[PDB]
Paper text:
Sliding clamps are ring-shaped protein complexes that are integral to the DNA replication machinery of all life. Sliding clamps are opened and installed onto DNA by clamp loader AAA+ ATPase complexes. The clamp loader of eukaryotes Replication Factor C ([name]) installs the sliding clamp [name] ([name]) in a coordinated and stepwise fashion. In contrast to typical AAA+ ATPases, clamp loaders are heteropentameric with the five different subunits called A–E.
To our knowledge, these are the first high-resolution structures of a clamp loader bound to an open clamp prior to DNA binding. Both reconstructions are highly similar (overall Cα RMSD is 0.74 Å, map to map correlation coefficient is ~0.85) and we refer to these structures as Open1 and Open2. [name] forms a right-handed spiral with a ~20 Å opening that is wide enough for dsDNA to enter. [name] opens at the A-gate of [name], disrupting the interaction between the first and third subunits of the [name] ring (termed [name]-I and [name]-III, hereafter). The open [name] ring is directly held by all five subunits of [name], burying ~3800 Å2 of surface area, an approximate ~1860 Å2 increase over that of the Autoinhibited states. The AAA+ modules of [name] adopt a right-handed spiral whose periodicity matches that of the six contact sites on [name]. In order to rupture the [name] ring, the AAA+ spiral of [name] widens, opening the A-gate. The [name]-E subunit uses its E-plug to bind [name], which pulls the A′ domain and E-plug up to 45 Å away from the AAA+ module. This reveals a large opening of the A-gate (at its most narrow, the A-gate is approximately 20 Å wide). p/t-DNA can therefore directly enter the open [name]:[name] complex. The Open1 and 2 states represent the stable intermediate state in which [name] is opened but DNA has yet to bind.
Author numbering:
A (entry chain A): 291 to 431, 435 to 779
B (entry chain F): 1 to 257
C (entry chain C): 7 to 335
D (entry chain E): 4 to 125, 129 to 354
E (entry chain B): 5 to 322
Amino acid sequence: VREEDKLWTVKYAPTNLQQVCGNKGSVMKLKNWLANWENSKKNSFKHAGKDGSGVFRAAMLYGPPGIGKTTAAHLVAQELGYDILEQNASDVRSKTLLNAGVKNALDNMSVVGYFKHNEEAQNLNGKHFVIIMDEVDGMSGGGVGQLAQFCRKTSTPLILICNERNLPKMRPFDRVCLDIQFRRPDANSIKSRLMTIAIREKFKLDPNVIDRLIQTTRGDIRQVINLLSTISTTTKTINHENINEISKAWEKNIALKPFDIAHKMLDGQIYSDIGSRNFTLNDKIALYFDDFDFTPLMIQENYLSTRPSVLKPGQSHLEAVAEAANCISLGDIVEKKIRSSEQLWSLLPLHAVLSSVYPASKVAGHMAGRINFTAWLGQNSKSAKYYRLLQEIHYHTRLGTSTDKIGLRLDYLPTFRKRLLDPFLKQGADAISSVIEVMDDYYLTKEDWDSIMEFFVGPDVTTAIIKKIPATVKSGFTRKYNSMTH
Amino acid sequence: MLEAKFEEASLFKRIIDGFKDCVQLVNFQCKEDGIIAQAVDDSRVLLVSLEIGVEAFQEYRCDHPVTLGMDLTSLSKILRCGNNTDTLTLIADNTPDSIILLFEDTKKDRIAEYSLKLMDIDADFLKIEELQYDSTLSLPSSEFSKIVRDLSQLSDSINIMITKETIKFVADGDIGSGSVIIKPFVDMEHPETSIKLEMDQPVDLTFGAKYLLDIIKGSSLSDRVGIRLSSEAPALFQFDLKSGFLQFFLAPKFNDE
Amino acid sequence: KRSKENLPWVEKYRPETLDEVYGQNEVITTVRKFVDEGKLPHLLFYGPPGTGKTSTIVALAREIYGKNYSNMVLELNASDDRGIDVVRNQIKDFASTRQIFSKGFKLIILDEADAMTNAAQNALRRVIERYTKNTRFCVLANYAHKLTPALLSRCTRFRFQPLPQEAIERRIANVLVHEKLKLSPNAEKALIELSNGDMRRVLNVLQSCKATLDNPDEDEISDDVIYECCGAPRPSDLKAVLKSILEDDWGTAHYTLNKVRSAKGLALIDLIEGIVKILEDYELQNEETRVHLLTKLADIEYSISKGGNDQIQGSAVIGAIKASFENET
Amino acid sequence: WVDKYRPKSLNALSHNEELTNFLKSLSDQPRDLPHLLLYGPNGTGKKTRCMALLESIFGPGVYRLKIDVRQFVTASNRKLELNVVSSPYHLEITPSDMGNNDRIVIQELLKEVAQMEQVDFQDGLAHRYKCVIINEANSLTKDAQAALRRTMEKYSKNIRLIMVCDSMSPIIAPIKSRCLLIRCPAPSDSEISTILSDVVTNERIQLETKDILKRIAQASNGNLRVSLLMLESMALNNELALKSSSPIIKPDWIIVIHKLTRKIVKERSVNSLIECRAVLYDLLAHCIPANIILKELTFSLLDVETLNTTNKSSIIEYSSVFDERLSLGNKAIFHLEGFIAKVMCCLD
Amino acid sequence: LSLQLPWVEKYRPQVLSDIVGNKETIDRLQQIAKDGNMPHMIISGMPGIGKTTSVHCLAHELLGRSYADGVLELNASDDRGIDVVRNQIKHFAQKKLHLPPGKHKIVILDEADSMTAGAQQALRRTMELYSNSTRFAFACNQSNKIIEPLQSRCAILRYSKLSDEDVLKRLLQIIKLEDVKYTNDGLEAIIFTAEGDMRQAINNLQSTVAGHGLVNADNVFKIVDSPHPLIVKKMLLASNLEDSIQILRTDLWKKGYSSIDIVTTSFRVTKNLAQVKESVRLEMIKEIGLTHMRILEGVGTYLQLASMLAKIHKLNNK
Ligand SMILES: Nc1ncnc2c1ncn2[C@@H]1O[C@H](COP(=O)(O)OP(=O)(O)OP(O)(O)=S)[C@@H](O)[C@H]1O
Ligand SMILES: Nc1ncnc2c1ncn2[C@@H]1O[C@H](COP(=O)(O)OP(=O)(O)OP(O)(O)=S)[C@@H](O)[C@H]1O
Ligand SMILES: Nc1ncnc2c1ncn2[C@@H]1O[C@H](COP(=O)(O)OP(=O)(O)OP(O)(O)=S)[C@@H](O)[C@H]1O
Ligand SMILES: Nc1ncnc2c1ncn2[C@@H]1O[C@H](COP(=O)(O)OP(=O)(O)O)[C@@H](O)[C@H]1O
Ligand SMILES: [Mg+2]
Ligand SMILES: [Mg+2]
Ligand SMILES: [Mg+2]
């Protein structure tokens, strides 16, 4: 055992909930939830509380790193006399091993708690489990699906801790469990802690530089503690005389997300005469290099949804948008050449400049609305889902149509609509005899009739006309089709 | 011409199985004395050297010394498609061309004539085994295999230390260590279990575990493995056959300390 | 059957020792002094294709160890797999053990390491320096951008300059000594200018013009034979075509171009290069002329690289030259 | 109807008599018929003439087809499936189905059918070559094209390649050279009108005069299949009574493109460009080729009369540029939005 | 046959005082070593500044004779997947070892930028839990490639390029220890061609010393081949097209440089050209990328580079 060898972050860790600086409301809500979990379990979790918290069995912790998520989750379980079961990224987590190891500890009792203390009546929940799943983001080895399935068939407090909530892999956690958001604390919460540390270590700290220390490391208090500890070995006076070097040498190089990268590259402040030397082009290309999978899509999605501020004299908004789109097309050509054969990966920075930097710089200004999510990822999936159905229909009709999968969609389907659907509108339920004698000719079925109607666009929209015909003819057509043999 | 008729069929299969997955390309030299071969590993660390005289062959006829290079994968493919009850004959024409492996049953007429196209391996015939070794020893193959495959689970390096009437195998890894110390002793009732040792200077040197695990695969041929060790010399692991011998020349791993 | 005379001239005249490597004197001298003093750091040869890198390193490996170089020297060319799983096992085991035959430092020749993945080079970055007092690495490359900066820094950079005229002339004389043959001085100058530094193209076209003699023992290889063997345009009709394009009208210029390019079966891709090389010497009294003259010609060359047409591109070259030679007036 | 009234021999082709005579000439000596490549406008009647020549050289039982399924595997585990329209004398493939795995399909199936031969009874094995039909050859990938070009001369006594495609330009020079090139001109108005007259006298549709068929032929731009289909749709909607006053039924996508051109020519702003991108998304998502969208949009824009000469000239220039860019990319919307922005900047 | 160690390895510093890099960070590491309470640290910087040697001397001074069993270094040659980081690193973390009071076990993870994200994720808690016995120390070249939590737990320590003064001091030390005849001009040329790289500087020193004996400007500029990016930067800033073309012909093309390397170097130089404006930089980069695409299809003659230079001059002049 030793007291000095500690890492300055475990000797000063909060040992009680009244020491967690910042986000009082979130930790208070979580404490009330963990306290009323038993009362909500008595009502089978089917009665929402004052804040609507008793209807959720599992808790979710998300926020920027280094704020006290794990610390709060440990202290709230230690204060109520519970027992702490903690699984983390180092342990192997998969649907098999998760259903093997912790599934049995989901509805069982504690074996070590029974020997802890039972002579005095402290609390009735000193024999139960609180399973803390930490760092849910890292599931490189049933990472999110099985854990989300644990949120419904649970019988013990289930606290989950992650870093970023809106990531697509952890979407199932959306409405199956309660979630709370921990924010970056201000400079007023950690100031008392930092001054008390400075008092207990015989080294000066001006109360005026702590705000800059919190600003250079956005929301990681542990980073501030490590910064102070590393510098307090040779310099014991940290004031406004050397704060610039500290703030410049200890910056945080966080990775930017599709929303933030677009918001940054679309800001008209960098491409000005002053900002061009404070945020150089090398940094702009590194911004793309942080995520080369979504940045071009984001830029193509929201390059014309902003109000520029770098418009050259004479050049309007439409011309700038046109040049941005031309460079977008060129970057698309470069990207296709990159991801084609020969695996030309040395052409990446040219794509970074053509697809992202140039169209952004051309329409750089102040964004009017919000950063919209890219739409091409969903449109391509829809196009593929429709192409599958078109190929199926074409290979069903190949015996008689004698036309490619392209010439059928552009030409045949307009007349097939008149032949198939129109008799059901103008003639009613007595045209059921005619329509069938059509589809048996082209080997169609009910599934093909369901798909053919969905292709038409423009004035002819069938997804609304289908709801207009009576339901009795709908129920009779399927029966007539299933009854007769081909 | 070259005609080599074996007495059995599985003999050549068991002979090749010693260094099946250890070397890829070999080159058999056939002379009036017998078949010799030497082949270097892919990483140029160990060398397999095989010598089989005219004792294991039922019939042998070779006029002039011939060299026949071939890969071991296709050779093993050809030996696998032959039944172990036939008689094997290696046939080579006047000039070195595709070698003819012929399987002929002893009861029913089954002529299985396979061809194997030769590779053009540079004839850098090597001359080792004339170097005076500092220490020589011999011990049963089962004990060596057990010791080496028990020590291989603790590390990737194995230090062999021959000291005054003591043999020491030391494995030092991450999870732990292990030391097997044996002493020379000879029994009269079981002359095959005796461990023999003749030393001139104490010798301590390291080897890798993968190469030892690949070498001990040859323990299916004989039962008494010989080990010759010497400073600044490749370690010699010899298996004695009924007609010749199969020897592995392993390179020792130097120590930075 | 098999003998030294059956090999092509590209390999038959391979330099055995370092003394038969002309041109790169300032690198061969340093390498010989390295091996003489006893110290030989990690080398990195970087040069254009066909300069002498592989020959130099093979001669060095022969000089260091002996006449049997491919015995204790490892060589990983582009023909073997060089993934991360290879640099982990094979190269490390070769660099962590001693030799089998003698007592010396081991040599590892990574030929054409520009074709290695970034992970393989990053893995090699530490094993190249962990075992230094036992093994030495030699990295041969043609494109110095495929290598990561770390691996590029750990090795001593030796650039192989293209062979100057004197070196190729000495090699031509040495080849003409061993092979009964005679070669004209103007033919020698044309061959030097066509070489473009490539020592392999020299020997190739030399074997070609020797084969096209019908008696390679008495008749001398004139410039016409060399120009015919490779089909390259002679400077004479090249300058004639350039003059007819610059001075004459459209009809007669197109006629003389189609007559010159059909008299010997020339190619437009070579005519463009020849005209560019001849016309780079002119003193244009403006900057806007050369800009268009280069841009349009490069576009036409890139289009020829795809083989669209054959006469439309020729008239395009004519039009580009004529329109570029108009801002002068 | 489209599929009902179709010629099934060479003595029944009733348009382009010169091409029919040339096909009859090529059907005299079957054992010396080289590889064929049909090129021409879309819906000209290329597949029907191909299957008619194929019936003229083989027996009449070539029309009875059957669909089969073949499963291939790439270098990885991704298993692909293709449909083959086989007949006892030939087989038809649509290699354009696979995205970038056509090189595997060609070099596998063509080799498989080239090595072995055909055996069937209809004097047990002796037969002539087998025919492979390739639909939409213009969409073939360059490496697949090289494989197909090389698997032509090696095994020539067994496989005869009869390919068809419109806009022959994306065909490499070797394939263009090592095969015969046959052009299929679209039928004239006086012949498509006769086709329509035969259809209307056979199907018993009530028409007043011959001007309706002339208007249909003029609207179809020469396309026989689209004209027949529009005639059938007009007969269906007009309740078995064709009159001199009938609205020509343009397909839905044509009307969408026309409304798009109206929106373009009316309002030249980025706010209209957003709705333009939305319309292009809705169009591409419903299985419409981007090149066809671009062609229709550009021609309808040139159709607009309120634009002068310079506007239409710059429009056609930008269209040629973005059409060149469209065949060298994958994300087609990335080029279509750029072309729309350029035409908006051009108009004002 | 004995082969002497290279000057880069024979004179590799084995004492933390011999490091001539950044004075502040080296003094911090020195005080940490004399005290012993070493916290987790990431060391990153330009290739060839002394990060690995600094952390290695730190470990050797902190553990002394226990360096054989107290340090577990994992390089890129050794496996660094999830399996090893979960099994071996953990088993070494809990390894009970009796060290002096103010000492700790150290884990040297060199080349941290090559590890998978899952490895760092699994390493987070393994490092955080046993802080009383294990103090990790990462040494990479790109701090952006490390995940955020692992980087935030440790105390970051940036490294800047070696100034010419430090390089000349170490060069003078080497010459004094090796008894070599030198002149000031040769040392200045070596520093200028070293582009702030200690290993490259020492290698070029040894090369020229063994090649000619006298370290003079002629010998180094003869067999060191003055750096590439500077010539390309000089080429792209010429006044008239003829001067830039002559530079490309004589200095780049005639000296045997592949066209792809010239194009890539020109792109990288224009990427960091702070003199010219932003729009001209973007247009120059676009034209250089067009030329790069033309080069990658196979056609890489001198005419393509000439037309690229002509286009850059047409762009910059108007
Ligand atoms: N509000 C706070 N008040 C005091 N100390 C804090 C606070 N937040 C964090 N700490 C310190 O930070 C350390 C605990 O780290 P945590 O913030 O709990 O890590 P985390 O929240 O789980 O974020 P991850 O897991 O690294 S993404 C201890 O040294 C605490 O003293
Ligand atoms: N300096 C030289 N002196 C004499 N002959 C040379 C020289 N350089 C090349 N040659 C000839 O060219 C042949 C091949 O040269 P290599 O050194 O193998 O080419 P290289 O340096 O490996 O370049 P690569 O590998 O094609 S990029 C030799 O066998 C010689 O015939
Ligand atoms: N500050 C320094 N003082 C003295 N020698 C140094 C210094 N920095 C580097 N060296 C020399 O460089 C070699 C060790 O450098 P390394 O630690 O390998 O460089 P590095 O920081 O690890 O960067 P990498 O790993 O190559 S990307 C030895 O030859 C040292 O003598
Ligand atoms: N000579 C002809 N007589 C009657 N109809 C024809 C003739 N030639 C083509 N057609 C019509 O063309 C239609 C088929 O067109 P198709 O060959 O599929 O176009 P494509 O050649 O583009 O594939 C058939 O419905 C048929 O009625
Ligand atoms: Mg945590
Ligand atoms: Mg080479
Ligand atoms: Mg290092």
